[PDB]
Amino acid sequence: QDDPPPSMLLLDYQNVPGIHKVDDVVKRLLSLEMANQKEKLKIKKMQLMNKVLENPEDTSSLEARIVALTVKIRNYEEHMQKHRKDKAHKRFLLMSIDQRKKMLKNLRETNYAVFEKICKELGIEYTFPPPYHRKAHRRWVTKKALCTQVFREVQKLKKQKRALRAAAVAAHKQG
Partner 1 sequence: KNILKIRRRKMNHHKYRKLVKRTRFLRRKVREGRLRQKQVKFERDLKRIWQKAGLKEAPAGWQTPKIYLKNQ
Partner 2 sequence: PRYELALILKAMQRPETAAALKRTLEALMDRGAVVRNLENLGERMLPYKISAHNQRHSRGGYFLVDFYAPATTVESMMEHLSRDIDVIRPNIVKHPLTQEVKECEGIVPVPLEEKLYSTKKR
Does 107 sit near RNA (CB under 7 A)? no
6, 12, 38, 149: residue in contact with RNA (rule CB under 7 A): 38
**Interactions with RNA, residue window 135-174 (CB under 7 A):** 135
Q: Which range of residues in 11-19, 35-43, 59-67, 155-163 is near partner 2 by CB under 8 A?
A: 35-43
Nearer to RNA, 9 or 71 (CB): 71
CB 124 within 8 A of CB 63: no
Q: Least Å distance between CB 33 and partner 2?
A: 6
CB 86 within 8 A of CB 80: yes
CB 38 within 8 A of CB 70: no
Dist CA 57 CA 64 (whole Å): 9
- Angle, CA of 158, 163 and 166, to the nearest 5°: 120
Cα distances (angstroms) measured from residue 155 to each of 144, 145, 162, 163: 17, 16, 10, 12
Q: Least Å distance between CB 25 and partner 2?
A: 7
Does 11 sit near RNA (CB under 7 A)? no
Tell me how long the chain is.
175
Does 86 sit near RNA (CB under 7 A)? yes
Binding partner of residue 95 among RNA, partner 2, partner 1, none, CB cut-off 5 to 8 Å per kind: RNA
Cα distances (angstroms) measured from residue 32 to each of 6, 13, 24, 44, 55: 5, 11, 14, 12, 26
37, 59, 142, 155: residue in contact with partner 2 (rule CB under 8 A): 37
Cα radius of gyration (the chain): 28
Does 146 sit near partner 1 (CB under 8 A)? yes
The residues of the shown chain that bind partner 1, judged by CB under 8 A, are 138-139, 142-143, 146-147, 149-154, 157
The residues of the shown chain that bind RNA, judged by CB under 7 A, are 36-38, 41, 59-60, 65, 68-69, 72, 75-76, 79, 83-92, 94-96, 99, 133-135
